[PDB]
């Protein structure tokens, strides 16, 4: 029982592929076995993505797991929506209803707007990356008219390789011109790391500044460097390490050799890798349920060419999509459930704060509640003088 | 992608056509890879894209200069995503540099279904307070709507 | 020490540091360079010779 599936990874994805293998081994069963075909390629090049996809389709896979960028997303959604091949991804959710695409990554918009509303910011600067996507920008801009906000949006995404460190000094000093202490980041962990590092270099991490790191991994990058700064830093965490399942995972994860499973020896794991693992679980449950529901999905013939005119799609793909979207499980990212579009529904995003003794969980965010406050409310005698 | 891979098989020397925000990356990537020259009247790409000739002239500079000419320090900006978000970044950075109060609203790309329902209250909320200056960035038909 | 100073963020323009050692430019000076704080030290090897 070999089930051929496709996988598409960037040339710069190590821990993700490692976690993929971890999912392959941990969730492998005796009933059936998945047989992954792996292709490392440049994600930004649509031609390369298309080439690899037509190759995978020539192999005749049942489902494809992979990543995409703002350049290659339309190719993926259009091709999968065309040929009826199921696609699973950790990458950013598309804006719209895109069929045959399962976005494992949950939406952060609600939690962010709820957070800004929580801290009552009426004026701030918002740094955005064009290399990822401009959706959240539109979100907070449209929200600015309703909530009466003064938002100064700056693109950090257009920066050269050699001159990229000037634009940061100019940015922060122009913010000295605007005298605005509240900032939001939302970028790649590496780009974020560079930003934080330059914040430390210019030394704007002193008390009085307030930063919001918008990403799902709060603890994935090194944020220890800004910890003793004195500036308040809030972010979101999708992987709660205080869970039994997560701990039993980290136990095995930490016991892996870094030579065989790159960047897996760490006790902390990037949320993307976690999403990959959970994706493996989900696919496994989906095909297991297909065999359990007595639905014959095996293709008797070859799918052949993806460029055949007119395009002839296979039928079992619909059944696979239905199987995938109807999966409800428990992974590293918490409760996993999908809607008819494939987006994540009913998820819990921990709201985290960075203090002196490290990160602490203040909130828990949901789609329906839109807000939840954990007890918190610590009181100290320090800097509180009982009246005389 | 299919039509491009075709006709190229016929061995054409140059390809003339149009593109949208969804298919633009396909055209530019494929033409930049296979070295097939592509001509378009549609919106210019944001960046340096080789083997692509954008016949359409840039409109950002003229817009910012016109806005500066009418001396508007506060205005509303309605935009569609189908032509690109470059002009948006332009007016945002120009708002940061020239100290403008710009209220930009996207009606484009159907980015939110919510708004469609009870959008009138929004437009009227901006209609009661200020909003003396408005700029339309859309398709001729969308403009008409 | 310098690293702990930048981490706690006392390298702002109000503070003044003196490196008394023979190598001033031998250590990593990029990190406190952009701080805005004045840092003066001693150098025994003149590269202008
Ligand atoms: C999420 O759906 C679950 C099933 O895990 C249920 O326990 C709970 O109702 C949920 N939260 C909401 C807001 O429906």
Curated annotation (Swiss-Prot), chain C:
Modification comment: Palmitoylated. Depalmitoylated upon L-glutamate stimulation. Ubiquitinated by RNF167, leading to its degradation.
Tissue specificity note: Detected in forebrain. Detected in dendrites of neuronal cells. Expressed in the pyramidal cell layers of CA1 and CA3 and in the granule cell layer of the dentate gyrus.
Induction annotation: Down-regulated in the pyramidal cell layer of CA1 in the hippocampus by global ischemia.
Residues linked to a glycan: 38
Annotated compartments: Cell membrane; Postsynaptic cell membrane; Postsynaptic density membrane
UniProt similarity note: Belongs to the glutamate-gated ion channel (TC 1.A.10.1) family. GRIA2 subfamily.
Name the record gives this protein: Glutamate receptor 2
Organism: Rattus norvegicus (Rat)
Residues represented out of the complete protein: 219 to 267 of 883
